[model samples]
Each structure stands twice: as C-alpha cells, then as structure tokens.
Target: MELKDDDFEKISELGAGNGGVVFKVSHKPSGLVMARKLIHLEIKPAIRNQIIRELQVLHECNSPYIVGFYGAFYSDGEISICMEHMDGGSLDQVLKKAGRIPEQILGKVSIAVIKGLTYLREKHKIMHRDVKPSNILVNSRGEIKLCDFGVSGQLIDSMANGTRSYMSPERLQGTHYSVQSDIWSMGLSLVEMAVGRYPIPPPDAKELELMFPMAIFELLDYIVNEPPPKLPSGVFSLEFQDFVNKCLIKNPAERADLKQLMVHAFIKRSDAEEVDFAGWLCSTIGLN
Candidate 1:
C-alpha cells in the first residue's frame, strides 16, 4: 500500500496507543490540517473488526463536543483515520503543565464533556468506556471535545473494558453500564483535574479485571460514608463539591445522570471565544 506523500506533509507524532499511532498531518490539497491515526498492517482480523466498529460509532456521532470524523483511508493493509486537528492538545497535557486545574475552569471544561456524555446517553444510549484526560481534547478555540471511541459500548448492549478507577462499582462487578457509569467516569476525571490524580490511582488494564471492583467499592464507601475529597484552597465552591459527590455515588442507580448535570450549579455557558478551557484554567490556576 502506497500513500501519496504529495497530498499530506506529516507534521508530528501526536500519540500512539494500542490501536494506532496518530500524526499531525497537513492536507496540501484542502489547505486543511487533520490528524491521521494509522493502524498496523499485521493486526488480527478480530481487532480490525473492532476498529471498524469504533469507526462506525464515530461516524454515527455528530455532536459539537465530539470531534468530527473526516474519513478513513486504507492502503497497503493499513488504516488511517482522518480527524479534526485539535491544536490545543489533550486535557492531560494541560494538567501536566499546571499540576492541578482551577475550579471555575474545571467547571467550564467538565460541563462541555458532561453535555456531550449526556447527549450520548439520552440520545445514542452509548457509554464511553474509557473517559480520561488524554482522551479529552481541547481545540485552539478552547472548546473541549471527547475522542477515542474504540472502547465505548452501549448501555444495554454489553459494553466492557471501561477503565477501573473511572468505573462505577456495579460496572466493576461485571454488571452492565449505563449513563450513570459515564457520570462516574466524569466525576473521577474531574477529581484528577482538580488535584492532579485519581482518588486511589487506577489500575492498569492488566489489573483491571481482578482488583477494579474493590477499588470501586472503596470509592463508593468514601462517597457515602466520608466527604468528597477536600478541594484545594479556594478551588471549588461548596455547591460544586456537592455536584461532584452526587455523580460519584456508589449506587449506579443513585448516581446523577447527564440531564441532572446540565442544570448543575457549577456549569457555565461560554461563547465560542471563551471556550478556551485550558487557557481559562491557566489564568485561573496560574500555570506556567
């Protein structure tokens, strides 16, 4: 398989994960910058099918908070996904620079994600199994968007492989996940953004199957018996803490749904220019 190098100038390596390597590629013909993630040629057929399934899922999603899927090209037994280039990079990069993010800015970014999760839950019945800082990207405009659907699954359709520390207790116990599970992931991610780490430090995938449930139960106990982890000085208001606790509830049934988060007091609507989620945090948190 040969790709015409004349059409795209590979700019830089953005990321490489289990499925593929992502490159910041500039499309010469369209004068458009796009991200290209390439899958290895020797991957198993089953894994290839799974990749196709994920691509199909992205094609089905058309939300503003979700990155736009330009198209995929296959050549020489390799698959490349053409996607919207997010200039600002992943939320993890921003968090790394700041050490910890600020409350109102976290409020702004998390709200955009929750809005997207809510739509995916209510309308599409999909749950993003893996929701973490690296998977959430912020564009140049500061708007937050969720990406990487490779591990996502439907609420009723036997979704599995969600990350442990971010998973609800029921899901950790092999119960099915729903919109509530997503809320749990969001709550955990929010905690990471606020304080620079997960509450208990999640397990790697190898450890996910065995010890994840215990971790979930432990967090559940804290959410019910103890208080939500304390906020950094002046980082969050009381109302915001309460909102987070509701989402992290142990009982998936009792957890706050996406609809509930929409009206959460901490959520603030921003104009397009104000969508700079990380820049807002940098200023609010005083990052370098």
Candidate 2:
C-alpha cells in the first residue's frame, strides 16, 4: 500500500529549514504521533539528493540517542519523512526558556549526545556536519536524541556546512573535517548552555542587534586567529572544564574522540539514577 498524506493529520509546525517544514502529525488509524518533514518538489537536485541521503542515514541508525525513523513517501510533488515526535522540543528552546540549565542536567544531556556521536562514528562511520542545541531533541521522559541529518556525510566533506557559531576553525577554512570537528561543536554547544549564551562578542553586549556587523567580523577573527573559545571560570566543575577544553582543541589531531569522552572524568561518574531528569525538567520548564 502506498503511504499518502491522508494517513497522517498535521498537528503543528515543528520547524523549518533546508527547503522544508517539519510537522508534528498523528497517524490517523493508530493515533501515534510522528514528525513529518515535507519537502516541496521544486527543490534543486542537490537538495533532493541530500533529502534522500538523510533518509538512507536515518534508516541505518538504530539507537536510543538518535531519533527513530518510521518511513518516507513521495507524492503530490512532495516528499514526507516520518520520524519520532520529540515532545520536549530542541535543547536550544529549553535553554532559552530556562535562561540556563543546571550543570548536572547539562552533563546528562552531553553524555547522551556523546553516545550518539560514538555510535555514528564507530558503527556507521558517519560525521554529523551539524552539531548544535537546535539539532538535539528531548522528550517528556527526558530522552535526548540527535536529529537533522540532511547535511551529514561519510567521514568528511570538503565544503563547510552547519551553523557558523558552532562550527570549528578548520571547517571555516574550507578544509576536510572529521569526527573531531563534531567534538568542537559539541564543546561550544555545552559552553553556550552553561553560560546561557554564545561565548563570542561578549555575551552581554547591550547593543547586540546593532553590533551584528562587528559581531560577525569579531567572531571570524576569534575562531581563525585567536584560541578556541572557553567556558568562564567558576561556572562549572574543574572536571567538566577539562572535558570541554579537550574537545575545543583548535588542532583536530589533538581533539578527543568519542572513546576518550566516554571515559572522561566528567562522564565517567555520571549517575543516571541520582538524576530525576524527567521530574527536574517538568519542574524547571513546567512541561506536563
């Protein structure tokens, strides 16, 4: 049987990017909620191939830390990608709402992402070109999963892709990037979460909107000429700071891989039992 749009009822827009809008939808018969990324047929061939590649990658992925893929279909001049509906929204949204997440919870989130990256690197030999809070999703049960694989490719890509703020210095220079590049983005993401904002251009710039021109110029200079960005002192534990430092190493050859991160002191002692992540999230964000 052919899967058609009528099979699912659109509930709301989840997000928009890369020439498509992701929708939260419910299966008409089963009533199970799923996310559908609908891409118009008018997109270019390269973008179309990217969508196809995304589907192929998602189909091969099977992990609790990665979003679940149900199926995909094409009809009516569009392609719909069905996936698990994460109720907790993106990590960025959570951080924006709470101002800042507690380091304890942030550590847990970081571990979940690392697990996903490890699987992608070891099992599939894939490199997620984009690694940022917006690509990480959470659910009511505190389950965190990585999403948005449209730009991911095997091992490396010569061209620079992904959000600039989270991109590594080597990537910005249009060099081939490996899994270590992902670690760089992951560190920046953690730093942003810990400090409640991006580390560049001074987080407290009062004229943030007016400083856009300077901000871009300054950020480029910092990433290229200056050292890797670091988390402010006293914001997190020494162990956590060390972990981020290892990840933010400007030299990709020296950056820590997933295996090293898995055993880092910051993650080695994490106690899932001690953290009531779901309960804490509910209380912290007022989610039902």
Candidate 3:
C-alpha cells in the first residue's frame, strides 16, 4: 500500500516560487496536515535511482532540526513529496511579519541552523548546498527545521546549479565547493534576517524584483572580488560578528567548520538554558 495522491487533499497553497507549487495538504484518513511539493517532469533514467535512494535517505533523517520526509508518490508526469508541516511557516515569512527579528532570536535560530547543517554533514555526509531564510522553517511548538534540502537540488537549476546570489566565491569561480560554501550562504542568510533584506545588490531589475539584471559574470566578479558581507558593528555583538565573519571567509580552506562553530561563543551561549526560543517564536509569529 504505497502512498498516492488520492491519500492527501490540498488544504491550501503554502507557496509558489521558482516555478514550483507547494501546498498545505491533509492526509484524509489520519487527518494529519503535511507540506507537499508538486513537480512535473520526465524522471530521466539517469537520475531516478538516486532520486528514490535519496528520498529513502530523507525518510531515515531523524534530526530535530531537519524536517521529516513522510513519503513520495509518482504518477504519470507528476511527483508529489510529503514533508512535515511546519505551521509557523518559513523564517522569511516570520521576518515579513515581525519586520526584523531581534539578534536574540536570530541567535537561537542560528544555533538550530548550525545543528541541522552539522547533522546533515556529520551524520549523513550531505551538505545543505542551499541555506537561506526560505528554506528554514519554524513550527508552532517553536521548533526550527530545514526543508527543501538534499532532494531539492533539482527544483531550481535554471539560474545556476545553486542560487547565484547566495553562491560563495569559490562556487562562483567554478571551483569545487564544500561545506564552507554553505557557511557563506548561511552567514548571508543570518544577516539578511537581521537587516530585513539581501544585504547586497539591485544596482542593475524591475520595481518588484529583488535584483536587476547583473549578468552572471558581473555577479560572479562582485562576489569573488568584493569583501564578504558583515554584520553591523555596533548593533550586533562581537561574538556574533565574529561568527558571521568566520563563516564568510573568502577562502574555504581557512573557514570555520561545524565542530568549531558548535563551540563558538555565540552558539555555545545560545545552547545554554536561558534563551526562551518558544516565547520568542510565539511573539514573532503572533501565536501569543
């Protein structure tokens, strides 16, 4: 009795981006809500095996910081994947609602993001490749989880293999990218949440667009030649600034790794007992 589209009913559209439609769906029999991403394409013979294997791996993922993969169903030209429903929604949504999240909350969220990324890289040998506010989610319970990961590398391959704006220097150079590349993206993501914007570019787009049309080469030149983005000095703590600075190093060889980050002053303090993540999340998302 494999899962099928008939088993769940779409409750509403959660988001529609990058040409993909995600829905808030309910498993009709159990009445449990889930996030479902629907995609239509030919499952090339070359990629299908790993697709199924990676889907299985996602199911086995049991990290508190990572969303659970329920199951996937394929029929005709479409495929639907079931994932844990995070009622509070993505952090980008939270930022939109709250204007800008306090560093206190970003601290807590940062620690969770680090743990999730660490879990994937350390435990499963997987790098989140994509790490941004839109991929990080929080639930009503105040739990943070990463989604659109692993198997999601396929969904947005049009601009670049990765989001070019978030791409690290080495990655932009067409050189090999490792976990440090992810750290760069994560660092930019953290600051974006703090400042309520991308923290760079738009010099070249339409009024509604986030970026104008900087050709790939120009964009690559900016990231590779320009200094890395930094947290506002006076507003952010020294520890937090150092943390982001460490992550945004131009050279991946010298960048801080997961073990170092786990014990960093900011993350170490965030792991302590005093931070009230649940309350902060409630206030930010208006659950209170």
Candidate 4:
C-alpha cells in the first residue's frame, strides 16, 4: 500500500492532455508494470473535481473488467495514480491494425464491456459519460478493461471525435439521458469493431475529422435522424444482431440496460464459449 516517486521507473508517455499525463511505469520492488496517471493539481473547481472524480472511481472499483487501481499520492503540485497496465493498447488501434474482428472474438469483448459498465452503473451510480473503442484497454493477454472515467480528450490518440461519435442519440439531441446512453455507444463500438470503420457514411468517405466543428450537424443528423444501425444480419449471428439492436435503440427508455444485457443471449452464450483471445491479441500486435 505504500508507494512513492522512487517506487516507479517511468517507461514511456502513454498520453497527456490538459493537466494530466498517463505513463507506463514499473514498480521497483515488486517489478510489476502499471499505468501511472499523473495530474498537475489545478485550483479551478471543475478541473480539480474531475481529477478527484477519476481517482475515486478507480479506487472504489473492484472488478476484473474494471482497471485495477494500485495506489495514489499527492506531491508538490501534482497527484500520481498507479493503476493496471494494458500492453496491447486501446481497441481503436486494434480495430485499425487487425481490420475487422471476427464475431467469435467480438463476443468476448462485448461481454467484458457490458460487465464493466454494469458494475459502474449499478454499484457506483456512475455513468461513463464517454464510452467507445478508445476507452477500452487491452493487454497482451487479451484481457479488456474499462478506463478513461473522467477525461476522453487526454489522448488525441484517437484522431476522430471518439466520444461524440459513440454518443447516444439522446445525448446528441441534448435531451433524455441515462445509462442507456452508454449502451448506444457500446453498440456503435461493436459495429465499428466488426466493420473496421465507422458505420455511418461521409465521415469515413471523406476522412473527415469527426472533431471538426463544421461537420457536427452532419454527424448529428446521421446518428439522430437516421435509423439505428444494424449488423449485417447475413454475416453475423442472430444473437449478436439482436444484442446490437437492443443497445442501439433510438429511445433511451426503450434501450436495453445493464441487467437486461447481462442475461442477453449473446452475452450468455459468449460466457460459455472459449476463444484464444490472447493469441488473437498477440497476433494483431505481432507481439511474438
């Protein structure tokens, strides 16, 4: 439980934005590798509270699907939090490098994400607010965990407006919201993983900076006015299609929640099935 600056050897910068930097670090005595989220303390209320908020969520959470927190300490003008390290990096990179993932592999990813979200929502009364491929981390072992509890902009590692792209319809419209918002993001994340590209048109066609302010309406219209997207029914199983369907429902009230999704046919079947997830991850990154 005791840790200090001398306890860690900084390996590299994972990413940094605003007031914090995420680093890959090693614990000196234990020789354990983990992520160190280093944030410069700011007196501004919102920014300061956001840093505290992320720390609280990581500290309080204790689930396999949630990133494990090691410890935290405040120094002269910054706070450093040591947490679990994921070597394979985030899913957006995987989806890009590996191309489309097979349903067999995607099922495992889906279950873990759902379980992570369920834990945060039911136990902590917290909404992720941002859920997407980039927020999910994977290690060489193929294990996936949810992260980025408070800040998504910390990494422009994702060139696109990763957060808003996965946002639920209600969020885009500035209307109804809840845990269902995350479900929508999860659904879209799944589709993007399968297709190896964003599901909507124009964005992918022109390679538009989804972050560009001018294209906001076009992005909004595609998600809000258009029908919820569907997985190619012919290419994917009924169970998977149904699962995505439940998550992408335009109406927040109608969208499936964590409890409902936890027992879904897709999730249950995936639970009992086995895949060489680590092998697939290793192959994608050429870790061998």
Candidate 5:
C-alpha cells in the first residue's frame, strides 16, 4: 500500500515528543481521521533501526486493548506512522484536567492496561518499558489502549532513558529489568490516578540538568529504602490497597505479573458487570 503525500489532510497537531511530532490527520479518500507520528531521521543507523523496530512492534499488535496501526510511510528522511485516533487523549491529560478518577473507573482502566501488557508479554515477548499514564490513551467511548514502544530508555546507569519517578526499584538501581518492572510502573500510575498527584514529588528546578539528578535520587530512595507508596487509609478499599501492594513489591520476584493482576479482587470489584464504563467515562469527562 502506498502512503501518498496528499492522501491525508492535516486536521491538527497532537503532541510533540523526543522522537517525533504527532498530528491528527484525516484520510482524504475515506474522510477518516487518525493519528500520524512523523519521525525525523538524521541518517543514523541506530535511529533508523529503532523506527523500524517500533513499526514492527505496532504492526504485530492486534488487540483491542492496544492502539491500532493502519500503515506507515517513509519520505524525505522522515517516517510517518498512521494509527487510530483517540479522542480523549492520554490518561496523563485526563488526570491533569480532572484530577483523581473514581475508584471503579480506575479499576477498569487498570484491567484494560494489564490485558494489553499481558498480550505483549505472552504473544510478542515484549515488555513495555514505559508504562506510565502518558502512554495509556483513552477514547471518548471509554476505550483505553496502550501506546508508544521501542523508545523506552535502554537499561543503563544514567537512568535518563525512562521516567525515573515511575521506574521500579530494580530499574533505579541500574539492575536488570523485566515485565515485573512494567508492573511496578503500572502500580505507580494507578496510585497517581487515584491520588491525583505523582507519588514522587518534583524538585524545585529550572532545568533538566537540575531536576534529573535530584528527582532520580529521591525516587531511588523512595522506591528502594522506603516502603512502597499506598492509598491513604479509609479513602480507598482494602482490596485496592492490596492490589497496589502486589504491583509495588520491592522484590521483582514477588510482584504480581499482568495475569495475576487482572483477576485480583480490586479489578474484579470494578469489572464491567459491576459498572457501566462507557457511561461513567462519558459523564466523568463530559464527553459528548
């Protein structure tokens, strides 16, 4: 399939990131709007290979819990990846706009993310090293899907590759990371969504140079020396607290994996049978 220059008409820009700029574009022929992430290349083999790997990963993903990939194109040293457009934006945006989400809706969101991660692990043998709220996209219809891959920081001592605040204890220590590391991140995101604040506090800084060092040190100390973050007593249920505990286990071996997390009592309590997710989200977010 050919991705023509005039095939898609630009609707608007979505967001910019380290790798590329995302645009909301409409297919001229079909009049269907979708997201196109156009990545600029500098002829570096590493960058080219990373883009290829990201495309390969997206192409292989075929689950409802994951963002859909339509096609891709390469032209003029830039690669454009076309994908399904999510109306509600990322969970990070939602949290910023609406503050804490209701516990039931939070459970549904957790389940969807866990299911997506499960598929990636069991079928693709890939672990989403970046599993924060920003990478979890939600649609107006209450559909939550996981996005972004192949750009997570590589395992290194620098700790600049991934979001340090969400990194697992093992990751902060520059040790080997696995799917359990992703679980640790998922736990942090859930708590953030629940409490309406990042579990780790940001430093008073004017630059990345200042913030990275202080923030990394604080997060490492919190995740390693301190007990895992938890929901305040009486505000949330015991089951919910326990579920977070399962995800935030300091020892990677003890952390509950995606499969185990999906069926936990907290998730079960907020299952579809117990809540009208679509209606709840539409109401909560004031979606038309």
Candidate 6:
C-alpha cells in the first residue's frame, strides 16, 4: 500500500539525513509506528537511481540487520518511503547511552554485523560502500539494523567500490576493491565507537555540507602517501592494532579477508562485561 499524506499521522521529525529527511509516523488506521524517509523534490534523475537501488537491495537481501521497506509513494512532488520504527534508536545513540560498550557486548554486536557483511559479500555479492555508525540502527530489543543502501555497490563475485578513507590504502590508491574494502570500513567503525567521534572530520561548512568523490580522492592520496600519525599513547589494544593494520594495509592482497579476520584472537575472545570493558578502555586512554 502507498503511504499518502492522509494515511499516516506525523508523530515527530526524527531528523534529516543523506539524500532525505525522516519523520516518525504512525498509520492512521492501525496506529502502528513507522519511519517515513523522503527524497527531496529537487533530486536529479541519476541520484534517484541510487534510491531505487536501495529498494532493490532491500528487496533482494532480506536480513534482520537490514531495515525492511514497507512501500513508497510520491505526492506533493516528493518521494517518500516507509520503514521499520527503531524504538531504541540508532547505534550512535546507544553508544552515547553506555558511553562505551563492553568488549563482550561489542563482540556480539560485531559478530552479528560481520556476519551480516559476510552474508552480503559472499551470498549476495553486494558491498555496502558506506558503513558508518550513523548507518547502523539499534532497537529497544538490542537488535542492530543496517539502513541506507544508497551508496551500496555490486561486487559481482570479484568487484569492489566504497568510501576512500574507509577503504584499504590499496583500494584508495586504485587497487580493485573486493570484500576487503568493507573490512576497512568495519575497522574504522570499531575505532569510532571506541573514540566517540570520527577520525577525519570535515574542515569547514562546505566540506561538512558536501564533498564529491574527486575531493575525497585527493584526501585519500594524502592519507596513503604521507606518514601516518602515531596511535594515541596506550589508546589501543594489541588486538585492535592488529585488526587496524590489516584494514590499512598498503596492499590489498596482504590484507586479512573475512575468514582471516574472523579467526583473529580478539574476535574469539569473550567480550568484557560493561563495567570491566569501560574500565579497561578508559585505562588505555589514561582516563582517571
């Protein structure tokens, strides 16, 4: 069924996001909660294809970690899509609530996410070009849902495409991407959760507002060609360092693939309890 203006009642404006803005809405008939994401009227035809691709992915790969698409509609000169309502909110918010999650919980979440990625990489042959904290949603039941397949690309059994900073140095520098590229994004997200922010923040309003692929290309060149800064003193575990190393490898061939990453000792280790994990992570940063 199509979601018309009169069909659902607006609950609240969740927030604006890439290629669209979202509203917390409810069905007028059943009063069931849902989120309505809308594409701006001015979106060009090419950009619109990306949105169509998102629906295609949702239709093709039905996974619990993925947000399900109820349906779409166009009225008032805009495109709107309805999706599952995440009662607990996004992973970003959950990280804010806990300050830092326990390693054990992190492990479980990571395993689920990695499994999800592995599923896409192997079974579906799809690559989520953009995998960040903002794209990950967590519900009240502690389930994680991945949304925004707008930037997703097909891997075609042996292909790759994705964000540069989140890509391995080789991929950033012109190497063909594969499942390994997703690993790079995964590593970046791990650090983001541990550090509470992004490693590369946009420099100004313009960059913050938007940046094209070429712009990112220049930045990635600098990152891969220049000497990397040292990791903050005691801010990382040996395990994390190892994982990060694999993701940042200058040569994609040398990077750890899914199976190798899965076998890492850290992935196998039991997750630390909430308090203990927080304490340990804090000590690494010398949090008194």
* Whole-structure CA lDDT of model 2: 0.77
Runs of candidate 6 exceeding 4 Å displacement:
41-57, 96-101, 150-175, 200-222, 227-236, 270-288
At residue 168, what lDDT does model 6 achieve? 54
**Most accurate candidate by TM-score:** 3
Clashes of each: 3, 0, 1, 0, 0, 2
- All candidates' TM-scores? 0.74, 0.86, 0.87, 0.82, 0.85, 0.71
lDDT of each: 0.67, 0.77, 0.78, 0.78, 0.77, 0.61
Off by over 4 Å in 4: 16-20, 39-42, 45-54, 74-79, 150-164, 202-214
- Candidate 1 residue runs with Cα over 4 Å from true position: 1-7, 41-57, 150-164, 201-235, 268-288
Better of 1 and 3 by lDDT: 3
- Candidate 1: TM-score? 0.74
Candidate number of the best lDDT: 4
Candidate 2 pairs with clashing backbones: none
Candidate 2 deviant stretches above 4 angstroms:
41-54, 150-164, 202-215, 271-273
Model 1 gets an lDDT of 0.67
Q: Candidate 3 — which residues are off by over 4 angstroms?
A: 151-164, 201-218
lDDT of 1 by residue, 152-257 (tens): 3321132221223555666666657666777777787887787776655343455333422346556655444554443343445777777778877777787777
Q: Model 5, range 2-119, lDDT digits (tens) per residue? A: 5566788998988887667899998888778999988675656565555555565567789989999887766667777888999888888888777778787788888898998988
Off by over 4 Å in 5: 45-50, 151-164, 201-215
**Per-residue error at 64 for model 1, in Å?**
2.1
The residue pairs found clashing in candidate 3 are 205-212
Which TM-score value belongs to model 5?
0.85
TM-score quality measure for candidate 4: 0.82
